[PDB]
Amino acid sequence: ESADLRALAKHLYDSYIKSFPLTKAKARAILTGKTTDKSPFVIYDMNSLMMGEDKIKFEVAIRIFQGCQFRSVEAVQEITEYAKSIPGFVNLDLNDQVTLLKYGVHEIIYTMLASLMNKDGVLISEGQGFMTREFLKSLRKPFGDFMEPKFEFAVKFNALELDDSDLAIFIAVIILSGDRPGLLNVKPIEDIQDNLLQALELQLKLNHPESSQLFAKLLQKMTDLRQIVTEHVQLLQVIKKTETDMSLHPLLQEIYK
């Protein structure tokens, strides 16, 4: 009944708060004035870049990309911590635990990145910086294009006006897919996702009573995530040929495929 599903919802939200520093709520408070204390240094061209390094401490195109990838790997750690708290997750076959994270983290990374973005740019270094979209778009060689798809998603995704309590459940749903390739035991995964889907449905009805079919519309966005991730990986294998200079982390090229 309703009551159990709210409990699951609260539990998740708490794990989310504990696993992710930098909530959407915090992000939105930074992006929308809201503060003297919280206001970000803005990077929009080469020079502001250099100041940033002096103030909001951490080829340019290479450094920026590598930094993105470094932050991704510590996001994966946060996501992994979160997953552990999803009821039932740790009781799964460990092979499957790994498979769910393997295929889930990117989709989740892009979901959360949307909270850090608006149409004009994206927060960086724990929200202290903000790097414009145009400045990203202008980078050398094939780097001038890695972030754009993610901005397009973000703008659409953020139109749903979800809050952290909505996102915590949606993220759990993503992890517990069961369509992931190479899963040994799909049934227990679906059973868990089933509950998550109910928790989410109820959560959205309560938290967005005015919003017709938000549940549906949110699930439809998973199509968009998947396309982003496949674009990213294919982009990646180019910035690996050409940039044989480039290296990837022990959490990453394992995930990639």
The binding site for a copy of itself (CB under 8 A) comprises 156, 177, 179, 193-194, 197-198, 201, 212-213, 215-217, 219-220, 222-224, 226-227, 230
Based on the shown chain and the rule CB under 6 A, indicate whether residue 71 belongs to the binding site for ligand MGZ. Answer: yes
Instruction: Give the CA distances from residue 219 to residues 69, 213, 216, in Å, rounded to whole numbers and listed in that order.
Output: 27, 10, 5
> How many DSSP H helices and E strands does the chain contain?
11, 4
Instruction: Give the CA distances from residue 224 to residues 2, 33, 150, in Å, rounded to whole numbers and listed in that order.
Output: 30, 30, 10
Q: Which is nearer to ligand MGZ, 68 or 222 (CB)?
A: 68
Distance of CA 48 to the CA centre of its chain: 26
Q: Which is nearer to a copy of itself, 117 or 225 (CB)?
A: 225
Quote the CA–CA distance of 190 and 202 in Å, as a whole number: 18
Q: Which is nearer to a copy of itself, 42 or 188 (CB)?
A: 188
Based on the shown chain and the rule CB under 6 A, indicate whether residue 64 belongs to the binding site for ligand MGZ. Answer: yes
Q: Which is nearer to a copy of itself, 181 or 250 (CB)?
A: 181
CA angle, 214 then 215 then 219, to 5°: 110
Distance of CA 251 to the CA centre of its chain: 16
| Among a copy of itself, ligand MGZ, none, residue 227 binds (CB under 5-8 Å by kind) | a copy of itself
| Among a copy of itself, ligand MGZ, none, residue 156 binds (CB under 5-8 Å by kind) | a copy of itself
| Among ligand MGZ, a copy of itself, none, residue 222 binds (CB under 5-8 Å by kind) | a copy of itself
256 is in an annotated binding site: yes
For residue 247, the minimal CB distance to ligand MGZ (Å) is 24
For residue 4, the minimal CB distance to ligand MGZ (Å) is 30
Residue 33 amino acid letter: G
**Binding residue for ligand MGZ, selected from 122, 162, 173, 202, defined by CB under 6 A:** 122
Reference 50, options 38, 40, 60; nearest CA is 60
Q: Which is nearer to a copy of itself, 197 or 239 (CB)?
A: 197
For residue 124, the minimal CB distance to ligand MGZ (Å) is 4
For the chain, the C-alpha Rg in angstroms (whole number) is 19
Neighbour-count burial of 243, counting CB atoms closer than 10 A to its CB (0-12 exposed, 13-18 middle, 19+ buried): middle
Based on the shown chain and the rule CB under 6 A, indicate whether residue 112 belongs to the binding site for ligand MGZ. Answer: yes
* Cβ atoms 9, 86 nearer than 8 A: no
Q: What is the DSSP string of 163-217?
A: -HHHHHHHHHHHHT-S-STT-S-HHHHHHHHHHHHHHHHHHHHHH-TT-TTHHHH
Based on the shown chain and the rule CB under 6 A, indicate whether residue 147 belongs to the binding site for ligand MGZ. Answer: yes
Q: Which is nearer to ligand MGZ, 115 or 195 (CB)?
A: 115
User: Which residues are documented as binding site for rosiglitazone?
Assistant: 69-72, 106, 232, 256
The residues of the shown chain that bind ligand MGZ, judged by CB under 6 A, are 64, 67-68, 71-72, 75, 109, 112-113, 116, 122, 124-125, 147
